[PDB]
Enzyme design. Structure first.
Site, PDB file in Angstrom:
ATOM      1  N   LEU A 143       0.831  -1.187   0.000  1.00 16.06           N
ATOM      2  CA  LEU A 143       0.000   0.000   0.000  1.00 16.06           C
ATOM      3  C   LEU A 143       0.882   1.259   0.000  1.00 16.06           C
ATOM      4  O   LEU A 143       1.720   1.415   0.873  1.00 16.06           O
ATOM      5  CB  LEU A 143      -0.808  -0.006   1.264  1.00 16.06           C
ATOM      6  CG  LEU A 143      -1.647   1.225   1.507  1.00 16.06           C
ATOM      7  CD1 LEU A 143      -2.859   1.224   0.585  1.00 16.06           C
ATOM      8  CD2 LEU A 143      -2.080   1.219   2.996  1.00 16.06           C
ATOM      9  N   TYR A 224      11.025 -17.963  32.209  1.00 18.77           N
ATOM     10  CA  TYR A 224      11.536 -16.670  32.534  1.00 18.77           C
ATOM     11  C   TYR A 224      12.871 -16.776  33.278  1.00 18.77           C
ATOM     12  O   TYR A 224      12.931 -17.265  34.398  1.00 18.77           O
ATOM     13  CB  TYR A 224      10.513 -15.885  33.324  1.00 18.77           C
ATOM     14  CG  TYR A 224       9.140 -15.861  32.709  1.00 18.77           C
ATOM     15  CD1 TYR A 224       8.780 -14.918  31.769  1.00 18.77           C
ATOM     16  CD2 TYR A 224       8.185 -16.776  33.095  1.00 18.77           C
ATOM     17  CE1 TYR A 224       7.527 -14.909  31.227  1.00 18.77           C
ATOM     18  CE2 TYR A 224       6.961 -16.757  32.567  1.00 18.77           C
ATOM     19  CZ  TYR A 224       6.631 -15.813  31.644  1.00 18.77           C
ATOM     20  OH  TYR A 224       5.362 -15.817  31.134  1.00 18.77           O
TER      21      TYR A 224
HETATM   22  C1  LIG Z   1       8.981  -9.635  13.493  1.00 23.81           C
HETATM   23  C2  LIG Z   1       7.931  -9.904  14.536  1.00 23.81           C
HETATM   24  C3  LIG Z   1       8.233 -10.775  15.581  1.00 23.81           C
HETATM   25  C4  LIG Z   1       7.284 -11.050  16.581  1.00 23.81           C
HETATM   26  N1  LIG Z   1       7.575 -11.893  17.588  1.00 23.81           N
HETATM   27  C5  LIG Z   1       6.657 -12.176  18.551  1.00 23.81           C
HETATM   28  C6  LIG Z   1       6.992 -13.126  19.644  1.00 23.81           C
HETATM   29  O1  LIG Z   1       8.109 -13.694  19.699  1.00 23.81           O
HETATM   30  N2  LIG Z   1       6.074 -13.354  20.585  1.00 23.81           N
HETATM   31  C7  LIG Z   1       4.862 -12.766  20.552  1.00 23.81           C
HETATM   32  O2  LIG Z   1       4.062 -13.102  21.469  1.00 23.81           O
HETATM   33  N3  LIG Z   1       4.519 -11.890  19.557  1.00 23.81           N
HETATM   34  C8  LIG Z   1       5.401 -11.574  18.574  1.00 23.81           C
HETATM   35  N4  LIG Z   1       5.045 -10.744  17.470  1.00 23.81           N
HETATM   36  C9  LIG Z   1       3.902  -9.849  17.581  1.00 23.81           C
HETATM   37  C10 LIG Z   1       2.782 -10.663  16.942  1.00 23.81           C
HETATM   38  O3  LIG Z   1       3.283 -11.296  15.782  1.00 23.81           O
HETATM   39  C11 LIG Z   1       1.676  -9.759  16.493  1.00 23.81           C
HETATM   40  O4  LIG Z   1       1.263  -9.026  17.643  1.00 23.81           O
HETATM   41  C12 LIG Z   1       0.503 -10.475  15.852  1.00 23.81           C
HETATM   42  O5  LIG Z   1       0.926 -10.819  14.535  1.00 23.81           O
HETATM   43  C13 LIG Z   1      -0.605  -9.466  15.626  1.00 23.81           C
HETATM   44  O6  LIG Z   1      -0.091  -8.410  14.807  1.00 23.81           O
HETATM   45  P1  LIG Z   1      -0.748  -7.956  13.436  1.00 23.81           P
HETATM   46  O7  LIG Z   1      -1.030  -9.053  12.569  1.00 23.81           O
HETATM   47  O8  LIG Z   1      -1.757  -6.884  13.774  1.00 23.81           O
HETATM   48  O9  LIG Z   1       0.504  -7.244  12.718  1.00 23.81           O
HETATM   49  P2  LIG Z   1       1.798  -7.972  12.196  1.00 23.81           P
HETATM   50  O10 LIG Z   1       1.875  -9.339  12.743  1.00 23.81           O
HETATM   51  O11 LIG Z   1       2.956  -7.075  12.392  1.00 23.81           O
HETATM   52  O12 LIG Z   1       1.465  -8.048  10.644  1.00 23.81           O
HETATM   53  C14 LIG Z   1       1.508  -6.832   9.875  1.00 23.81           C
HETATM   54  C15 LIG Z   1       1.759  -7.237   8.449  1.00 23.81           C
HETATM   55  O13 LIG Z   1       1.480  -6.123   7.594  1.00 23.81           O
HETATM   56  C16 LIG Z   1       2.444  -6.107   6.539  1.00 23.81           C
HETATM   57  N5  LIG Z   1       2.584  -4.725   6.047  1.00 23.81           N
HETATM   58  C17 LIG Z   1       3.143  -3.714   6.704  1.00 23.81           C
HETATM   59  N6  LIG Z   1       3.074  -2.595   5.953  1.00 23.81           N
HETATM   60  C18 LIG Z   1       2.498  -2.911   4.783  1.00 23.81           C
HETATM   61  C19 LIG Z   1       2.173  -2.157   3.646  1.00 23.81           C
HETATM   62  N7  LIG Z   1       2.438  -0.813   3.521  1.00 23.81           N
HETATM   63  N8  LIG Z   1       1.533  -2.805   2.653  1.00 23.81           N
HETATM   64  C20 LIG Z   1       1.227  -4.141   2.752  1.00 23.81           C
HETATM   65  N9  LIG Z   1       1.556  -4.894   3.831  1.00 23.81           N
HETATM   66  C21 LIG Z   1       2.168  -4.276   4.867  1.00 23.81           C
HETATM   67  C22 LIG Z   1       3.701  -6.603   7.217  1.00 23.81           C
HETATM   68  O14 LIG Z   1       4.474  -7.201   6.209  1.00 23.81           O
HETATM   69  C23 LIG Z   1       3.193  -7.653   8.175  1.00 23.81           C
HETATM   70  O15 LIG Z   1       3.112  -8.932   7.523  1.00 23.81           O
HETATM   71  C24 LIG Z   1       6.045 -10.412  16.549  1.00 23.81           C
HETATM   72  C25 LIG Z   1       5.744  -9.550  15.499  1.00 23.81           C
HETATM   73  C26 LIG Z   1       6.677  -9.265  14.486  1.00 23.81           C
HETATM   74  C27 LIG Z   1       6.235  -8.284  13.395  1.00 23.81           C
HETATM   75  C1  LIG Z   2       1.123 -20.546  26.882  1.00 26.10           C
HETATM   76  C2  LIG Z   2       1.516 -19.629  25.769  1.00 26.10           C
HETATM   77  C3  LIG Z   2       2.055 -18.323  26.354  1.00 26.10           C
HETATM   78  O1  LIG Z   2       0.962 -17.393  26.498  1.00 26.10           O
HETATM   79  C4  LIG Z   2       2.730 -18.434  27.745  1.00 26.10           C
HETATM   80  C5  LIG Z   2       3.112 -17.055  28.242  1.00 26.10           C
HETATM   81  O2  LIG Z   2       1.949 -16.355  28.672  1.00 26.10           O
HETATM   82  C6  LIG Z   2       3.967 -16.375  27.216  1.00 26.10           C
HETATM   83  C7  LIG Z   2       3.896 -16.746  25.779  1.00 26.10           C
HETATM   84  C8  LIG Z   2       4.734 -16.152  24.844  1.00 26.10           C
HETATM   85  C9  LIG Z   2       5.647 -15.200  25.252  1.00 26.10           C
HETATM   86  C10 LIG Z   2       5.723 -14.826  26.611  1.00 26.10           C
HETATM   87  C11 LIG Z   2       4.893 -15.411  27.580  1.00 26.10           C
HETATM   88  O3  LIG Z   2       4.980 -15.066  28.885  1.00 26.10           O
HETATM   89  C12 LIG Z   2       6.653 -13.864  26.999  1.00 26.10           C
HETATM   90  O4  LIG Z   2       6.775 -13.500  28.221  1.00 26.10           O
HETATM   91  C13 LIG Z   2       7.453 -13.287  26.014  1.00 26.10           C
HETATM   92  C14 LIG Z   2       8.376 -12.337  26.413  1.00 26.10           C
HETATM   93  O5  LIG Z   2       8.418 -12.030  27.717  1.00 26.10           O
HETATM   94  C15 LIG Z   2       9.243 -11.743  25.489  1.00 26.10           C
HETATM   95  C16 LIG Z   2       9.163 -12.112  24.124  1.00 26.10           C
HETATM   96  C17 LIG Z   2       8.243 -13.092  23.720  1.00 26.10           C
HETATM   97  C18 LIG Z   2       7.391 -13.668  24.666  1.00 26.10           C
HETATM   98  C19 LIG Z   2       6.465 -14.621  24.264  1.00 26.10           C
HETATM   99  O6  LIG Z   2       6.391 -14.949  23.043  1.00 26.10           O
HETATM  100  C20 LIG Z   2       3.013 -17.810  25.289  1.00 26.10           C
HETATM  101  C21 LIG Z   2       4.040 -18.890  24.966  1.00 26.10           C
HETATM  102  O7  LIG Z   2       4.553 -19.578  25.827  1.00 26.10           O
HETATM  103  O8  LIG Z   2       4.501 -19.083  23.593  1.00 26.10           O
HETATM  104  C22 LIG Z   2       5.586 -19.956  23.277  1.00 26.10           C
END
Ligand SMILES: Cc1cc2nc3c(=O)[nH]c(=O)nc-3n(C[C@H](O)[C@H](O)[C@H](O)COP(=O)(O)OP(=O)(O)OC[C@H]3O[C@@H](n4cnc5c(N)ncnc54)[C@H](O)[C@@H]3O)c2cc1C
Ligand SMILES: CC[C@@]1(O)C[C@H](O)c2c(cc3c(c2O)C(=O)c2c(O)cccc2C3=O)[C@H]1C(=O)OC
EC number: 1.14.13.180
Length: 535
Positions: A143, A224
């Site tokens: 976009l 943790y």
């Molecule tokens: C790199 C990354 C690592 C993550 N790691 C963790 C984790 O370890 N643990 C955890 O609990 N949560 C993690 N998350 C957060 C979790 O993935 C998100 O909170 C969940 O996906 C909900 O987010 P969302 O889909 O609203 O946005 P996102 O998951 O960020 O998806 C947004 C998407 O929109 C696309 N996009 C952006 N701009 C444009 C554009 N201009 N045009 C078209 N497409 C676009 C991006 O490519 C992306 O695919 C991570 C997120 C990211 C982005």
């Molecule tokens: C049972 C599932 C669960 O929700 C358990 C728990 O609630 C938890 C999850 C995930 C994360 C963290 C959680 O604490 C968390 O602390 C965190 C963080 O501190 C820093 C980065 C990523 C993470 C993160 O992705 C979830 C899980 O275990 O996924 C493998």
């Protein structure tokens, strides 16, 4: 004038976007996802599906694929959550002792349980179900910008995209910005965020190593880590040989992601496991700034924020993905009803009113968990936890689509001792249809469900009169009639007595109730429905 080319354009194919699309497509809405990336990410990111997510995945018809798919639990089908100094080491505190016990904790307030897929397993199931219901997706498509068109001249949104053959315009009736934390959409509309802001910075390392040697059987789970040397967390994936590690770092002390060389990483992995026989193979090293940020607005005209774009929460407590899935569910069923002529535009305002409060509930719970599990010294900076299940399952909504009588300011209740008040989930109660034993919760989600008291046959007749009137599905169930109550507990939990009724929305939230009989049940019910649907 020209037909819009698509009813909804959803931007981003993360969980927030794929949720919005899967639930829109199921409702017969023409929806197009665009995604700048050439394909869905294989990285785990957010894992685990909570019971509220599971309730909606059930509504969406993907619950059985979700349960069959590869999860992150160990080969003994278990999962533990702990504070320890090192992974293979001595436990500071046990959050969850097992998986069966994690589910047990909320089982009396829901028939759904947990699933444990990583993001890269769950997204393909959403995308597939969107497509089966007629949704579509375009990868490698970005976009660039959009213009809006007032109702006279449309209404709609014209969006400019950058695909592989270069630039083009697309007209949608709505634009949903599910495009992440750095949201082109939110930033373009000039919408600020509020909240605590930056929390901490951490480096994630996804790595491969056979831990068969240094981890005792059945010891898979989330850790943790309060180590002399570092602060972090450590996790499984759905491959027994692949793991994640996160390590806190201070930029104000001069530390940077650049310092986490392959070296440092293997070193910290050595430390986290208290095993130096380890030679890991490093898949990815990514710096992450964790924060708490909520969009001031979730909607401008026909443009909506959903997911991370609308709110960034610390990852603590595993609510990140679960909140996106739920934003998407809310947006979908409200957009569907408006697009089909079932509701007026006023319903779309409930999106913000409801999901913006939910965002605040999620963030508060995440900060509180960060404190309790990673930074005990911060517990005062933020309000104490209101409770994990009260946040996920006992939450209450207020908006034009919730007809509440009281005004108790509380935003959660114990989900285990529910009130049945408007704004909360209709309680879980075991009942049976003619032999089929089900939760009252499994009764919700087609359109609107109405539960009538023993004597409320008039309410049942109304459910049909009003469906026909408004063109909305109202499924009506009466106690002691077509719905068996062995314990006689539905009246009592929903607060409908013998002669009242409880009206439950498409997301399973109670919209309205009475504990007595109306003078004219059809007049009252029509009035209630006209109001919450903005007709
Ligand atoms: C790199 C990354 C690592 C993550 N790691 C963790 C984790 O370890 N643990 C955890 O609990 N949560 C993690 N998350 C957060 C979790 O993935 C998100 O909170 C969940 O996906 C909900 O987010 P969302 O889909 O609203 O946005 P996102 O998951 O960020 O998806 C947004 C998407 O929109 C696309 N996009 C952006 N701009 C444009 C554009 N201009 N045009 C078209 N497409 C676009 C991006 O490519 C992306 O695919 C991570 C997120 C990211 C982005
Ligand atoms: C049972 C599932 C669960 O929700 C358990 C728990 O609630 C938890 C999850 C995930 C994360 C963290 C959680 O604490 C968390 O602390 C965190 C963080 O501190 C820093 C980065 C990523 C993470 C993160 O992705 C979830 C899980 O275990 O996924 C493998």
């Amino acid at each position: 004038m020209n037909d819009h080319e698509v009813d909804v354009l959803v931007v981003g194919a993360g969980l927030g976007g794929l949720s919005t699309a899967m639930f829109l497509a199921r409702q017969g809405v023409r929806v197009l996802v665009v995604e700048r990336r050439p394909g869905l990410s294989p990285y785990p990111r957010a894992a685990g599906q909570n019971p509220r997510t599971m309730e909606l995945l059930r509504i969406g018809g993907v619950a059985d694929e979700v349960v069959r798919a590869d999860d992150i639990r160990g080969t003994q089908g278990d999962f533990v959550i702990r504070l320890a100094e090192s992974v293979r080491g001595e436990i500071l505190r046990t959050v969850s002792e097992s998986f069966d016990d994690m589910v047990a904790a909320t089982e009396p307030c829901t028939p759904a349980g947990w699933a444990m897929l990583s993001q890269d397993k769950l997204e393909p199931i959403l995308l597939a179900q969107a497509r089966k219901h007629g949704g579509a997706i375009r990868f490698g498509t970005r976009l660039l910008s959009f213009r809006q068109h007032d109702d006279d001249a449309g209404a709609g949104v014209t969006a400019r995209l950058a695909g592989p053959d270069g630039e083009y315009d697309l007209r949608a009736g709505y634009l949903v910005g599910a495009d992440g934390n750095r949201s082109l959409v939110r930033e373009s509309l000039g919408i600020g965020r509020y909240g605590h802001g930056t929390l901490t910075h951490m480096v994630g390392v996804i790595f491969d190593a056979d831990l068969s040697g240094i981890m005792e059987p059945g010891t898979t789970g989330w850790y943790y880590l309060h180590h002399p040397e570092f602060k972090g967390t450590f996790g499984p994936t759905d491959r027994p040989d692949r793991h994640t590690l996160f390590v806190e770092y201070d930029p104000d002390e001069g530390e940077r992601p650049e310092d986490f060389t392959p070296q440092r990483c293997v070193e910290l992995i050595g430390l986290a496991l208290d095993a130096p026989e380890v030679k890991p193979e490093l898949v990815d090293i990514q710096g992450w700034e964790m924060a708490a940020r909520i969009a001031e607005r979730w909607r401008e005209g026909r443009v909506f924020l959903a997911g991370d774009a609308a709110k960034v929460t610390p990852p603590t407590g595993g609510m990140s993905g679960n909140a996106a899935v739920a934003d998407g569910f809310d947006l979908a069923w409200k957009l569907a009803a408006v697009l089909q002529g079932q509701a007026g535009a006023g319903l779309l305002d409930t999106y913000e009113d409801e999901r913006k409060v939910a965002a605040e509930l999620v963030v508060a719970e995440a900060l509180a968990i960060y404190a309790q599990r990673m930074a005990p010294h911060m517990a005062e900076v933020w309000d104490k936890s209101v409770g994990y299940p009260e946040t996920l399952l006992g939450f209450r909504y207020r908006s034009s689509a919730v007809l509440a009588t009281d005004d108790d300011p509380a935003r959660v209740e114990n989900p285990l001792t529910p009130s049945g008040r408007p704004g909360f989930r209709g309680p879980h109660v075991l009942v049976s249809r003619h032999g089929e034993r089900l939760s009252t919760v499994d009764l919700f989600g087609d359109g609107w469900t109405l539960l009538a008291g023993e004597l409320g046959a008039d309410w049942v007749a109304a459910a049909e009169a009003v469906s026909a009137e408004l063109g909305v599905p109202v499924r009506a169930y009466r106690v002691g009639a077509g719905l068996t109550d062995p314990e006689s507990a539905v009246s009592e939990r929903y607060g409908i007595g013998k002669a009242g009724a409880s009206l439950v929305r498409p997301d399973g939230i109670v919209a309205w109730r009475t504990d007595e009989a109306a003078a004219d049940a059809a007049q009252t019910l029509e009035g209630v429905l006209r109001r919450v649907l903005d007709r």
